[PDB]
Ligand binder design. Sequence first.
Ligand SMILES: CCCCCCCO[C@H]1O[C@H](CO)[C@@H](F)[C@H](O)[C@@H]1O
Length: 158
Amino acid sequence: FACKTANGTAIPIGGGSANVYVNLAPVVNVGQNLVVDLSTQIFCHNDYPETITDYVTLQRGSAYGGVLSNFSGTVKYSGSSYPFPTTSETPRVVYNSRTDKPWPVALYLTPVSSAGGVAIKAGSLIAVLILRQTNNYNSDDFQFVWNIYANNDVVVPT
Ligand SMILES: CCCCCCCO[C@H]1O[C@H](CO)[C@@H](F)[C@H](O)[C@@H]1O
């Protein structure tokens, strides 16, 4: 089991970490969602589907900088919604193919009432998402750490 980003940055068997640079909607009004869809950014696969089933969860999702200060978050994992920053490990997603499958994580961020102006700064860390991988074969328990960065400023109109 290993993962890669849309630009080809890989995290090999055993886990590790990688940076993910995301383009964000430049203008987000109070009452609207800023959607950060990681399913177009992070892809994973099973290296031995003939014998092994891989189990994948979002173990933790943490908010940073402007996302932590200016937004009220929700994380959607494989069609179910949870608070973001996270309060528990999600259920598992099964990886049973050698063909790349997107990691089904999306952040839904709505401005808090005090937000206004430059709510997210270009180049800042916005989130850290922990992908946890286990299997039905051995004792492997690996973490694939995704450091999410904003490519641009996000303005919340006043
Ligand atoms: C004849 C025995 C060969 C065993 C191959 C083991 C390959 O291990 C990797 O891929 C597995 C499937 O994706 C993961 F279960 C592991 O955790 C590990 O990532």
